[PDB]
Amino acid sequence: LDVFEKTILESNDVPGMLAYSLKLCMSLMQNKQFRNKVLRVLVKIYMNLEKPDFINVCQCLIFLDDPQAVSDILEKLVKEDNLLMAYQICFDLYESASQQFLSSVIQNLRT
Amino acid sequence: TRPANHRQLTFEEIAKSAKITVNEVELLVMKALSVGLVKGSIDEVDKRVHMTWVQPRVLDLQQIKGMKDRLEFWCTDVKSMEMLVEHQAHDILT
Amino acid sequence: AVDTAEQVYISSLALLKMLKHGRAGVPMEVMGLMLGEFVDDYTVRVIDVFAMPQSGTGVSVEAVDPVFQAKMLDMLKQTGRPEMVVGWYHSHPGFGCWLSGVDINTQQSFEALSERAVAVVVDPIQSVKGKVVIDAFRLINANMMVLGHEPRQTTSNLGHLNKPSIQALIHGLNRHYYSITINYRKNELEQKMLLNLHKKSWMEGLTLQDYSEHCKHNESVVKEMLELAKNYNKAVEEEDKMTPEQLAIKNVGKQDPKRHLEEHVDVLMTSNIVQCLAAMLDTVVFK
Amino acid sequence: AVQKVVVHPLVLLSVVDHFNRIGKVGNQKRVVGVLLGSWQKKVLDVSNSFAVPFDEDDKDDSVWFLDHDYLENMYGMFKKVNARERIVGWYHTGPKLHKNDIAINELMKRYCPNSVLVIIDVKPKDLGLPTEAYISVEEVHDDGTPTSKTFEHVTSEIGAEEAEEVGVEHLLRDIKDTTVGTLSQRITNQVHGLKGLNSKLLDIRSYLEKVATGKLPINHQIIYQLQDVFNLLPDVSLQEFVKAFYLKTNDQMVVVYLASLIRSVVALHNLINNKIANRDAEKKEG
Amino acid sequence: DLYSRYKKLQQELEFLEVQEEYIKDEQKNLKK
Amino acid sequence: SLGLGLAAMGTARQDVYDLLKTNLYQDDAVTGEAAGLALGLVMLGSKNAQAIEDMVGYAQETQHEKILRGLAVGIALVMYGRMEEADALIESLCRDKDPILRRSGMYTVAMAYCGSGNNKAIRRLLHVAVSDVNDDVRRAAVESLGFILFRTPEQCPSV
């Protein structure tokens, strides 16, 4: 895990090298056991990036099923107070995620 | 009394076990084959007889123990030689 | 109305009574009753079958006294549990399956009390081992044949699956009756206990086989297998010759070596490999 | 007296459906019915059956009933509807040889002289043939009683017929072991019948449970055969039984060695029959 | 991208091993 | 009931499950698609194993066929995308004598591997497509291939 986190925090340019690695770690991934261990650290560094990407931290999350982590960063965008960038974190969540996940996350949105 | 290995007694042993001379035991065993109580064959020059079948008798609760243990290891022999067949010809029919 | 998805469930038990009574008096049209259990407007279940004493001719067959009928049903109520007559059958001998002009008439008598009396034909000649050709029918009104109106209002993708024969189409199908798709009610109650009861043996294989003659039979084949190979020492030698598609039509008067020469090789193998292996187990097992 | 019996699969099946029809009693019922058939050429035939009403109470289990009017009229119908058919005896569903079947046979022997019975199976698990039949013999003899009568098993098999072979082979449509080649014998009686000999070695192991602890009658007429089996145990491996065994292996394998030699040449002639159709079309067709 | 060459040719044996089994059991089953 | 479970699809509502119990135990043919289809819809991907035990324990003793048919789709739909968590049931229905329930076992592995390119499915999902004798189950077996392999449309025309 941490030498893979060191691939993305090294002397390496990022045009798109932190994008297709997310594609490889979802498409040709063997099991869920090595998927979630890789996928959870690839978007905390996106939060650690100077521009937090929004569609991939929601795309990974419904693969990871965290009904509280999207509400934590929804709080950050309510704290930031712009529905322009609190938008694709939300309609990508409505389009992709299931009805039960949107019925489970709603306790964390109104609280 | 003798096992199924040999059961091949000699004429001198009958001369011991029945205290009768040599020139009458052949006259004795030809009677025994004629009545039907025993089924075997008679040699004369090697002085032995190949008895094959004897008349079945009765037995108490001790000779069944002989038929208990002699029967019991014949179970695993039927087990052991068949165990090859369900293992070696297994893919030939599932 | 009906939906032409009628799906008549029968049994596993009735059809053997159908064919045995159908074949023991085969060239005459034998017939009987169908004693079953009704379910909803779509399906029907026929579980038991019995016949009657009959009197017949060449083209017609009748029944006799009705006192046989009521006394038979009383004895089947008291032994087992009661049922109800779901229909009737008959047996075209070697014809096929259709309603003839007299077969349609007693059907017309039976469709009045209950309107769902199933008419069944069994042919115990056309049935070789597989197909058992059965094809149960039921009438349609010839009054709607006069109207030119097409009945039965197809509402399921289940009717037009089996195609009728042309010979049954020469007859009243489809101007006075229709066909019904059927299957068979199968269960471990019965299916396990006809498989594991019919083709079974006990000693046919733990025994040897005519030990002085098996090796003798291992020459009764090999001796002519020499001269049959002499024909195989002949027929290949006339190749690089006239275009062996010609060597298919021409050789239909006499036997070829090539197919007959691998015929005995299977026979000369399994006769030996079985008899060699079965002898070498009795050495181990029997002392 | 009787060579063997011949049972059709219909009457095999015509008990099971009645066993379903009385299966709602739950507690206890044996199916007992009238067996119909026509024995000819000293071979017992079985064709048709039904079942007669029959009950049994456990306390004083010597009280049976056969409603003979149901036996009179329905056979009279069956004698009408098939005059070739007649009575052949009776049967019962036969799990474990119940006690009333010593005089059920004597109750209805005034119809059939050799009133044979048939024991069938309703829960099939075996490695044999799950149809059993006995015969009635009586004896004023060796030791037991002045009035002694014990049933004796005549051998049993399921006969087929050209009418019903159409039916049963349509009714199977299931897992099958057809194409009898080198392998059907390996599994019908080399995999199977060796384990068939298990439950017969283990069956006499079950009588052996009386050595000092089991039931009180001891042997007298059971051990004359068991004394014979260890006596008729086969010959040991010292004689030319060793030598004449290698003799025939040295004869039976030569035929296999010739037959396998032929198998290689035939497929090699087939190999050129594909090299005639490979090279002579790539220039022609392309 | 040889690790991408490895998945696709791990996906080959993933996909080929079943196919050679798939026609193999037809061989008896069509005969039956 | 078909409109009711459709709007309450995958919702695990107890209120729709209440009147769907008494719709199920009617012992009636015509309620067969009414009960068993909506009984799976409201429990989509729930795998509530008592309700599976209620369903597979019910479609073994009834004597109509739409009640054997509506539950055949309903018990396939209670599990969704499980990858290992259906396989004891998959072995259970495929071993059973029921041709509908063997056919129902084919749809369940088809929904336990939605888009999943697993070999462990494709060994015996497609082995029973060769060997099984009913034509109903053989049509369900080959129509389970696109539902497990729509993730790559390149390989499916090749097989």
UniProtKB/Swiss-Prot annotation, chain A:
Component of the 26S proteasome, a multiprotein complex involved in the ATP-dependent degradation of ubiquitinated proteins. This complex plays a key role in the maintenance of protein homeostasis by removing misfolded or damaged proteins, which could impair cellular functions, and by removing proteins whose functions are no longer required. Therefore, the proteasome participates in numerous cellular processes, including cell cycle progression, apoptosis, or DNA damage repair. Belongs to the proteasome subunit S1 family. Component of the 19S proteasome regulatory particle complex. The 26S proteasome consists of a 20S core particle (CP) and two 19S regulatory subunits (RP). The regulatory particle is made of a lid composed of 9 subunits, a base containing 6 ATPases and few additional components including PSMD1. Interacts with ADRM1. Interacts with ZFAND1. Disulfide bonds: none annotated. This is 26S proteasome non-ATPase regulatory subunit 1. It comes from the Eukaryota.
From Swiss-Prot, chain B:
The keyword Membrane does not apply. GO terms for biological process: meiosis I; proteasome-mediated ubiquitin-dependent protein catabolic process; ubiquitin-dependent protein catabolic process. The chain holds residues 283 to 376 of 376 of the full protein. The gene is PSMD13. Component of the 19S proteasome regulatory particle complex. The 26S proteasome consists of a 20S core particle (CP) and two 19S regulatory subunits (RP). The regulatory particle is made of a lid composed of 9 subunits including PSMD13, a base containing 6 ATPases and few additional components. It comes from Homo sapiens (Human). One of its GO terms (cellular component) is ficolin-1-rich granule lumen. Belongs to the proteasome subunit S11 family. GO terms for molecular function: structural molecule activity. Component of the 26S proteasome, a multiprotein complex involved in the ATP-dependent degradation of ubiquitinated proteins. This complex plays a key role in the maintenance of protein homeostasis by removing misfolded or damaged proteins, which could impair cellular functions, and by removing proteins whose functions are no longer required. Therefore, the proteasome participates in numerous cellular processes, including cell cycle progression, apoptosis, or DNA damage repair. It comes from the Eukaryota. The modification N6-acetyllysine is found at residue 16. Keywords: Acetylation, Proteasome. The keyword Acetylation applies. This is 26S proteasome non-ATPase regulatory subunit 13.
Curated annotation (Swiss-Prot), chain C:
A motif (JAMM motif) lies at residues 90-103. Keywords: DNA damage, DNA repair, Hydrolase, Metal-binding, Metalloprotease, Phosphoprotein, Protease, Proteasome, Ubl conjugation pathway, Zinc. Zn(2+) binds at residues 90, 92, 103. It is an enzyme of class 3 (hydrolase). GO terms for cellular component: cytosol; cytosolic proteasome complex; extracellular region; ficolin-1-rich granule lumen; nucleoplasm; nucleus; proteasome accessory complex; proteasome complex. It comes from the Eukaryota. Coiled coil: none annotated. GO terms for molecular function: endopeptidase activator activity; K63-linked deubiquitinase activity; metal ion binding; metal-dependent deubiquitinase activity; metallopeptidase activity; proteasome binding. Residues 8-143 form the MPN domain. InterPro entries: JAMM/MPN+_dom (IPR000555), JAMM_MPN+_peptidase_M67A (IPR050242), MPN (IPR037518), RPN11_C (IPR056263). One of its GO terms (biological process) is double-strand break repair via nonhomologous end joining. SMART domains: JAB_MPN (SM00232). The modification Phosphoserine is found at residues 127, 201. The modification Phosphothreonine is found at residue 243. Widely expressed. Highest levels in heart and skeletal muscle. Its EC number is 3.4.19.-. Component of the 26S proteasome, a multiprotein complex involved in the ATP-dependent degradation of ubiquitinated proteins. This complex plays a key role in the maintenance of protein homeostasis by removing misfolded or damaged proteins, which could impair cellular functions, and by removing proteins whose functions are no longer required. Therefore, the proteasome participates in numerous cellular processes, including cell cycle progression, apoptosis, or DNA damage repair.
Curated annotation (Swiss-Prot), chain E:
It comes from the Eukaryota. The chain holds residues 39 to 70 of 418 of the full protein. It comes from Homo sapiens (Human). This is 26S proteasome regulatory subunit 6B. It is found in: Cytoplasm; Nucleus. Belongs to the AAA ATPase family. Component of the 19S proteasome regulatory particle complex. The 26S proteasome consists of a 20S core particle (CP) and two 19S regulatory subunits (RP). The regulatory particle is made of a lid composed of 9 subunits, a base containing 6 ATPases including PSMC4 and few additional components. Interacts with NR1I3. Interacts with PAAF1. Interacts with TRIM5. Interacts with ZFAND1. Component of the 26S proteasome, a multiprotein complex involved in the ATP-dependent degradation of ubiquitinated proteins. This complex plays a key role in the maintenance of protein homeostasis by removing misfolded or damaged proteins, which could impair cellular functions, and by removing proteins whose functions are no longer required. Therefore, the proteasome participates in numerous cellular processes, including cell cycle progression, apoptosis, or DNA damage repair.
